[PDB]
Amino acid sequence: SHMSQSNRELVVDFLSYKLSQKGYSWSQFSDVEEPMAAVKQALREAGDEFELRYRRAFQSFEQVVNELFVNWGRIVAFFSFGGALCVESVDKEMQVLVSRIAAWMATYLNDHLEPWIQENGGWDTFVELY
Amino acid sequence: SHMSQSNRELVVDFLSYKLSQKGYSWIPMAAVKQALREAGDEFELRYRRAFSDLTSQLHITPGTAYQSFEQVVNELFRDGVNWGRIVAFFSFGGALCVESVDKEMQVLVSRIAAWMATYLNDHLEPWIQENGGWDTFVELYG
Amino acid sequence: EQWAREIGAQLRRMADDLNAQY
């Protein structure tokens, strides 16, 4: 019960570490938008080494982990998998979401704003004003 | 001259470090090496995701590995040099190397397997079947 | 075409992030 708070604290520390490392540093402050330090750092270095050693793995997730399992190396594989899982999922949605908006922006900008810009000195005069 | 040979030491060390790391065992320099190793590890840890198979993506056919390498590295240093780029240089080489050894391991396994499997069928399968098959081998051993 | 140029360019941008952070 009380030790489970420490486990949830480690899980979050790992995922935010992995996400930042992977270029999603807002992960540190995203939950806010709504010695432990030794254990954390140890687990971080561990997951790094796992990822470096092994390339890829090619609540249904709960079954997949039942496959992976019980020793420390597997507990580290467990954490690494979870981070790998998040990161992949954050990737897929980011690309999808961004390309949608980018498409809508580019589509609109060309269909509606372009005749006005070419007519009005172009992107040159824009820069000239600034 | 001495500095040129030490560079060779660095490259060889990095390539070796990368190979074992990926599961193929077998002031002072050591500081530089470890620093280079780590910097490479960070680089790969941050960015590896974007690439799939560098060989595949580069379309490396046997007569164009060297060219593709030089082309990549030349573009990498297109407009200058910083330590970030030099790290990516060592990092890029290591990925190539590991990728190559991997592909070649498969190639060698594929060949010898074919030699052996051809022999097994053309020369050994008849005797195996005359003597009760593999089941009787397993009885004999275990 | 120019996959090597493309990829080398990608490495260059990545390399420059790493250098900016040191």
Side-chain angles (χ1 to χ4, degrees), chain A residues 4-7 9-33 35-54 56-57 59-61 64-67 69-130, chain B residues 4-25 28-51 53-138 140-142, chain C residues 1-4 6-22:
Chain A
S4 69
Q5 178 206 45
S6 291
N7 283 12
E9 191 177 347
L10 287 176
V11 168
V12 160
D13 169 87
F14 191 86
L15 294 183
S16 93
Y17 171 74
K18 226 50 184 167
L19 278 166
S20 292
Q21 178 183 80
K22 260 49 173 188
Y24 295 119
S25 94
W26 185 254
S27 55
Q28 310 179 40
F29 317 96
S30 71
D31 210 310
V32 178
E33 208 174 342
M36 269 288 290
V39 181
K40 285 174 174 174
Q41 184 181 358
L43 187 51
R44 287 183 186 192
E45 298 191 346
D48 280 352
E49 295 176 356
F50 182 89
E51 175 180 320
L52 290 168
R53 184 76 168 76
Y54 313 99
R56 215 170 61 94
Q59 203 187 335
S60 300
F61 137 102
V64 192
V65 186
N66 288 329
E67 295 300 321
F69 289 97
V70 46
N71 86 292
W72 292 110
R74 298 177 173 84
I75 297 192
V76 168
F78 168 66
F79 272 90
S80 294
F81 173 62
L85 184 54
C86 292
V87 172
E88 285 186 18
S89 310
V90 182
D91 290 342
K92 60 150 192 185
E93 213 73 42
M94 200 201 197
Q95 181 179 356
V96 161
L97 290 179
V98 170
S99 50
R100 286 187 188 276
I101 316 297
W104 300 349
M105 291 185 69
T107 292
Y108 183 95
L109 174 58
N110 284 128
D111 286 12
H112 295 299
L113 311 185
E114 174 86 300
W116 182 90
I117 292 187
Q118 282 181 348
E119 127 181 0
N120 271 17
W123 282 113
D124 320 325
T125 45
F126 169 76
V127 174
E128 294 182 12
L129 303 170
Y130 295 67
Chain B
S4 71
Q5 183 240 341
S6 75
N7 297 334
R8 170 97 187 181
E9 267 191 51
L10 290 180
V11 168
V12 171
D13 180 80
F14 189 89
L15 296 189
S16 313
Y17 170 73
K18 276 305 162 174
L19 274 168
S20 64
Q21 176 187 95
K22 304 261 177 299
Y24 308 89
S25 306
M29 275 285 97
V32 186
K33 316 230 270 204
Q34 188 171 350
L36 205 45
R37 291 177 172 193
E38 294 169 354
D41 291 336
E42 183 180 1
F43 185 85
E44 176 190 332
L45 281 169
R46 312 212 82 208
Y47 311 109
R48 188 49 229 253
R49 250 191 309 162
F51 311 105
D53 204 48
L54 284 178
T55 296
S56 310
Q57 278 172 307
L58 288 167
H59 295 52
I60 294 174
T61 54
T64 60
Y66 176 80
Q67 314 188 182
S68 281
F69 175 80
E70 292 289 319
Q71 278 170 308
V72 168
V73 176
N74 278 321
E75 181 69 13
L76 172 52
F77 296 115
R78 178 191 136 255
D79 62 329
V81 182
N82 58 62
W83 296 111
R85 300 182 176 193
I86 299 193
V87 164
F89 170 72
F90 275 87
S91 195
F92 165 68
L96 255 185
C97 182
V98 164
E99 239 159 78
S100 310
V101 172
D102 204 326
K103 302 318 171 293
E104 182 69 11
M105 196 179 63
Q106 303 176 44
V107 167
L108 286 176
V109 170
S110 196
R111 252 154 75 179
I112 310 193
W115 299 354
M116 294 174 57
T118 290
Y119 198 92
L120 225 38
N121 307 333
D122 295 340
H123 289 265
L124 298 181
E125 183 67 294
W127 179 87
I128 293 176
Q129 293 296 74
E130 290 179 13
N131 302 47
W134 285 103
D135 293 352
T136 64
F137 170 83
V138 178
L140 264 185
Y141 208 100
Chain C
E1 290 277 300
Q2 313 295 82
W3 329 87
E6 293 186 62
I7 285 182
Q10 300 173 19
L11 286 179
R12 203 212 300 118
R13 299 198 311 269
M14 292 166 177
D16 288 342
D17 280 22
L18 196 74
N19 184 67
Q21 291 170 348
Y22 308 92

